[PDB]
């Protein structure tokens, strides 16, 4: 319940629905004009954010110190409004919790919240042929179109959902140092 209340408030304050040429995704704004999308959203020079064209001034595909994919792309938007700064909800390291909620908001899944239970730091996954690290894992019946969803627990933003296989979902851990 507390995770759900936290999630609804967080989504209302910091999330949007985004379309890139590669698909439709939930997008979380972090601070200033920096937001995050799963890497496979492959944003171009402009995105559609809540049905409106928004320019992308910079983008950074995140990899670790040895170039290993982290499956996140940070984007700096050409926007006057600043995101409410939620870096205080981002952990310095991968978070494990017993009860989390995954929040999605797209035209396919509007305002939907899913209790996913326990989140575990799984670490390495080969995603489509791409070695990837810092993966958080949780179980629920996954569906296409959920990437970009926000994984949260009471007082914490844990990660961004990047993929699912059957009843297994996974998020890239959303770490504080990615935003300074």
UniProtKB/TrEMBL annotation:
Single annotated GO MF: RNA binding
Organism superkingdom: Viruses
Keyword annotations from UniProtKB, A to Z: Capsid protein, Covalent protein-RNA linkage, Host cytoplasm, Host-virus interaction, Hydrolase, Magnesium, Nucleotide-binding, Nucleotidyltransferase, Phosphoprotein, Protease, RNA-binding, RNA-directed RNA polymerase, T=pseudo3 icosahedral capsid protein, Thiol protease, Transferase, Viral attachment to host cell, Virion, Virus entry into host cell
Protein family according to the UniProt entry: Belongs to the picornaviruses polyprotein family.
Span covered, complete protein: 6 to 185 of 252
Keyword Transport recorded: no
Listed GO CC annotations: host cell cytoplasm; T=pseudo3 icosahedral viral capsid
Subunit and interaction comment: Interacts with RNA-directed RNA polymerase.
All copies of domain Peptidase C3, residue ranges: 1-179
Subcellular location: Host cytoplasm; Virion
Keyword Nucleotidyltransferase: yes
BP GO terms, sorted: proteolysis; symbiont entry into host cell; virion attachment to host cell
Protein name: Genome polyprotein
Main location (coarse class): host cell
